[PDB]
Amino acid sequence: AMDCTTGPCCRQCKLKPAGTTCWRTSVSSHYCTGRSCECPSYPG
């Protein structure tokens, strides 16, 4: 509607749906909670 929420976990101009990975490294692997564009600091 208004807040497009730009960033890594964002659907172009909206909040990316929960489940979208945004923190997977050699010793990391998390997912999005479809609540915010920023990746959470906890595993799925």
Which domains does the chain possess? 1-44 (4.10.70.10)
What technique was this entry resolved by?
A: NMR
6, 37 contact by CB (below 8 A): yes
Of 28, 25, 27, 17, residue with least CA distance to 37 = 17
What is d(CA 6, CA 33) in angstroms, rounded to the nearest whole number? 16
44, 20 contact by CB (below 8 A): no
* DSSP state letter for 15: B
1, 15 contact by CB (below 8 A): no
Task: Tally the C-alpha atoms within 13 A of residue 2's C-alpha that lie toward its C-beta.
Answer: 0
Of 42, 36, 30, 31, residue with least CA distance to 5 = 36
16: left (phi over 0), alpha (psi -120 to 50) or beta: beta
Which residue bears the tokens 């692997």?
A: 29
